[PDB]
Amino acid sequence: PFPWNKIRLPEYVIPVHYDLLIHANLTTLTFWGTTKVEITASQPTSTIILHSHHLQISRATLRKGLSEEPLQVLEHPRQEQIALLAPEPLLVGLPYTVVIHYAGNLSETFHGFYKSTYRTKEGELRILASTQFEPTAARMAFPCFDEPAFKASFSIKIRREPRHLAISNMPLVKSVTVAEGLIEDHFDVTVKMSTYLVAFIISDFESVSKITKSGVKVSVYAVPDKINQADYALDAAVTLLEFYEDYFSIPYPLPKQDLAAIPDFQSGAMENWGLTTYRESALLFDAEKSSASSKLGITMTVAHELAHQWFGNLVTMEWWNDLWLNEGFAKFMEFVSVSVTHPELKVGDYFFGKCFDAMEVDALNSSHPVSTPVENDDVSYDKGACILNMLREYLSADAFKSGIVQYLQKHSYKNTKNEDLWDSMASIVDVKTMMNTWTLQKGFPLITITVRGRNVHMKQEHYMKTGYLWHVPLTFITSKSDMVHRFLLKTKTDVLILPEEVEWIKFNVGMNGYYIVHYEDDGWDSLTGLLKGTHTAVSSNDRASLINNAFQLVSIGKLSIEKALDLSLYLKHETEIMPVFQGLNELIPMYKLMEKRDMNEVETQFKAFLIRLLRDLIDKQTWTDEGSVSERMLRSQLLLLACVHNYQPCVQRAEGYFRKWKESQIEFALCRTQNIEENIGWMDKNFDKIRVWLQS
Ligand SMILES: *[C@@H]1O[C@H](CO)[C@@H](O[C@@H]2O[C@H](CO)[C@@H](O[C@H]3O[C@H](CO[C@@H]4O[C@H](CO)[C@@H](O)[C@H](O)[C@@H]4O)[C@@H](O)[C@H](O)[C@@H]3O)[C@H](O)[C@H]2NC(C)=O)[C@H](O)[C@H]1NC(C)=O
Ligand SMILES: [Zn+2]
Which DSSP string corresponds to 636-686? HHHHHHHTTTT-TTHHHHHHHHHHHTT---HHHHHHS----HHHHHHHHHH
Residue 476 in contact with residue 485, Cβ under 8 Å?
A: yes
Dihedral of CA atoms 191, 196, 197, 198 in degrees, nearest 10, equals 70
Q: Is the dihedral of CA 355, 361, 367, 368 positive or negative?
A: negative
User: What is the Cα–Cα distance from 118 to 668, expressed in whole angstroms?
Assistant: 35
Residue 328 in contact with residue 381, Cβ under 8 Å?
A: yes
Instruction: For residue 339, give every residue at least 6 positions away whose Cβ sits within 8 Å of its Cβ, in sequence order, or none.
Output: 347, 348
User: What is the Cα–Cα distance from 149 to 326, expressed in whole angstroms?
Assistant: 14
Q: Which residues, listed in sequence order, are joined to residue 155 by a DSSP beta bridge?
A: 19
Q: Helix (H, G, I), strand (E, B), or coil: what is residue 300?
A: helix
The residue contributing the CA closest to ligand 1 atom 29 is: 180
Q: Which of 31, 106, 161 to mutate to test the pocket of ligand 1 (most atoms within 8 A of CB)?
A: 161
Amino acid at the residue 665: Q
User: What is the Cα–Cα distance from 306 to 218, expressed in whole angstroms?
Assistant: 11
Instruction: For residue 5, give every residue at least 6 positions away whose Cβ sits within 8 Å of its Cβ, in sequence order, or none.
Output: 79
CA distances from 653 to 166, 516, 617, 633, 671 (A): 57, 42, 16, 19, 21
User: What is the Cα–Cα distance from 318 to 323, expressed in whole angstroms?
Assistant: 9
Residue 86 in contact with residue 48, Cβ under 8 Å?
A: yes
What's the CATH number for 1-205? 2.60.40.1730
Q: Helix (H, G, I), strand (E, B), or coil: what is residue 458?
A: strand
Amino acid at the residue 291: S
Respond yes or no: is residue 161 known to be catalytic. Answer: no
CA of 615 to the centre of ligand 2 (A): 42
CA of 272 to the centre of ligand 2 (A): 10
| Sheet with 206-211: strands ordered across | 206-211, 217-222, 256-262, 275-279, 269-270
Count CB atoms within 10 A of the CB of residue 637: 16
Count CB atoms within 10 A of the CB of residue 183: 18
Q: Which numbered atom of ligand 1 lies nearest the CA of 23?
A: 49
Q: How was this structure determined?
A: X-ray
How buried is residue 8: exposed, middle or buried, by Cβ count under 10 Å (0-12/13-18/19+)?
Answer: exposed
CA of 341 to the centre of ligand 1 (A): 50
Q: Helix (H, G, I), strand (E, B), or coil: what is residue 613?
A: helix
User: What is the Cα–Cα distance from 268 to 291, expressed in whole angstroms?
Assistant: 19
The residue contributing the CA closest to ligand 1 atom 39 is: 181
Strand bridging mode 153-160 / 67-70: unpaired
User: What is the Cα–Cα distance from 86 to 46, expressed in whole angstroms?
Assistant: 5
Domains 1-205 and 444-519 share a fold: yes
User: What is the Cα–Cα distance from 149 to 146, expressed in whole angstroms?
Assistant: 9
User: What is the Cα–Cα distance from 595 to 438, expressed in whole angstroms?
Assistant: 40
User: What is the Cα–Cα distance from 224 to 217, expressed in whole angstroms?
Assistant: 20
Q: How many helices (H) and strands (E) does the chain have?
A: 17, 29
CA of 142 to the centre of ligand 1 (A): 27
Residue 134 in marked binding region: yes
User: Phi and psi at residue 420, in whole multiples of 5°?
Assistant: -65, -35
Resolution of the structure in the document, Å: 3.0
Residue 56 in contact with residue 47, Cβ under 8 Å?
A: no
CA distances from 216 to 41, 155, 252, 278, 472 (A): 37, 21, 8, 20, 42
User: What is the Cα–Cα distance from 176 to 324, expressed in whole angstroms?
Assistant: 43
Amino acid at the residue 553: L
DSSP of 358-424, one letter per residue? HHHHHTSTT---SS-------HHHHHHHHHHHHHHHHS-HHHHHHHHHHHHHHTTTEEE-HHHHHHH
Q: Which numbered atom of ligand 1 lies nearest the CA of 161?
A: 49
Indicate the fold that domain 444-519 takes in CATH: Immunoglobulin-like (2.60.40)
User: What is the Cα–Cα distance from 495 to 500, expressed in whole angstroms?
Assistant: 15
Residue 287 in marked binding region: no
User: What is the Cα–Cα distance from 51 to 80, expressed in whole angstroms?
Assistant: 6
Residue 507 in contact with residue 498, Cβ under 8 Å?
A: no
User: What is the Cα–Cα distance from 512 to 431, expressed in whole angstroms?
Assistant: 17
- The second-level CATH assignment, the architecture, of 206-443 is Orthogonal Bundle (1.10)
Q: Is the dihedral of CA 652, 654, 656, 662 positive or negative?
A: negative
Q: Minimal CA–CA distance to 298: which of 310, 278, 283, 308?
A: 283
User: What is the Cα–Cα distance from 404 to 409, expressed in whole angstroms?
Assistant: 8
Q: Minimal CA–CA distance to 105: which of 20, 21, 50, 27?
A: 27
Q: Minimal CA–CA distance to 296: which of 254, 349, 257?
A: 349
Give the side-chain half-sphere CA count within 13 A for 694: 19
Q: Helix (H, G, I), strand (E, B), or coil: what is residue 297?
A: helix
Q: Helix (H, G, I), strand (E, B), or coil: what is residue 482?
A: coil
DSSP of 505-559, one letter per residue? EEESGGG-SSSEEEETTTHHHHHHHHHHHHGGGS-HHHHHHHHHHHHHHHHTTSS
At CB < 8 A and 24+ separation, what contacts does 292-299 make? 292/626, 292/629, 293/629, 293/632, 295/232, 295/345, 295/629, 296/345, 296/347, 296/350, 296/629, 298/232, 298/233, 298/236, 299/236, 299/240, 299/338, 299/341, 299/342, 299/345
DSSP state of 498: -
Q: Which of 68, 161, 180, 305 is catalytic?
A: 305
Q: Is ligand 1 within 6 A of the CB of residue 181? A: yes
Give the side-chain half-sphere CA count within 13 A for 233: 38
User: Phi and psi at residue 162, in whole multiples of 5°?
Assistant: -60, -30
Residue 304 in marked binding region: yes
